[PDB]
């Protein structure tokens, strides 16, 4: 089957990464469910903004980690080899799982 899960920080970089990996699989050797979303992890941080005193004043930050799934339901020979050695898309982590 091969559940392909991939995640990134930018919401509109991962979209074309999920579109290209599906298209280099759907077209080349059939079968795909789709871009399954999953919940976004929002790791927040609340650092003191000044170098000394002034506890009230802080800045708040976050890093939206956007997950995505693919899910194919047949181990095709054209598709399985296209996943390996043919990903690219920088700033987008990917983890194929059999």
């Amino acid at each position: 089957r091969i559940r392909i899960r991939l995640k990134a920080f930018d919401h509109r970089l991962i979209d074309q990464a999920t579109a290209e990996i599906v298209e280099t699989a759907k077209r080349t050797g059939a079968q795909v469910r789709g871009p399954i979303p999953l919940p976004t992890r929002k790791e927040r941080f609340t650092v003191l903004i000044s170098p000394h005193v002034n506890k009230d004043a802080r800045d708040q930050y976050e890093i939206r980690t956007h997950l995505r799934l693919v899910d194919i339901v047949e181990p095709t020979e054209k598709t399985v080899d296209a996943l390996m050695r043919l990903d690219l898309a920088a700033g987008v982590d990917v983890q194929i799982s059999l």
Binding site: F45, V47, D59, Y61, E62, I63
Partner: protein
């Protein structure tokens, strides 16, 4: 934050990775409820002090990499609260925009 305080911290990291990331068997495995409870368990805690005072990972303060500040640390970035701010709003920590909800 004192080059000496930064330079003594590199001993604590290097010397800990040598001994106790390997020789935790002396405390963990030997000091245990089993047949080695008699003189073997006594010789463990006896021999555990023969080691240097440093090596214990609890003796590492965990200070900022750029400056060396002890307080205001964050484990995700490995930086002080000051340098993470300066780096965040600048373009160095990926995906770290200003939050508001």
């Amino acid at each position: 934050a004192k080059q000496s305080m930064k330079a003594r911290e590199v001993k604590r990291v290097a010397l800990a990775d040598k001994y106790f990331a390997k020789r935790a068997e002396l405390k963990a495995i030997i000091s245990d409820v089993n047949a080695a409870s008699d003189e073997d368990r006594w010789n463990a805690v006896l021999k555990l002090q023969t080691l240097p005072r440093d090596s214990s990972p609890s003796r590492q303060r965990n200070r900022c990499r750029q400056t060396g500040r002890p307080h205001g640390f964050l484990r995700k970035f490995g930086l002080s609260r000051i340098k993470v701010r300066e780096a965040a709003m600048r373009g160095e920590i990926p995906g770290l925009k200003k939050a508001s909800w």
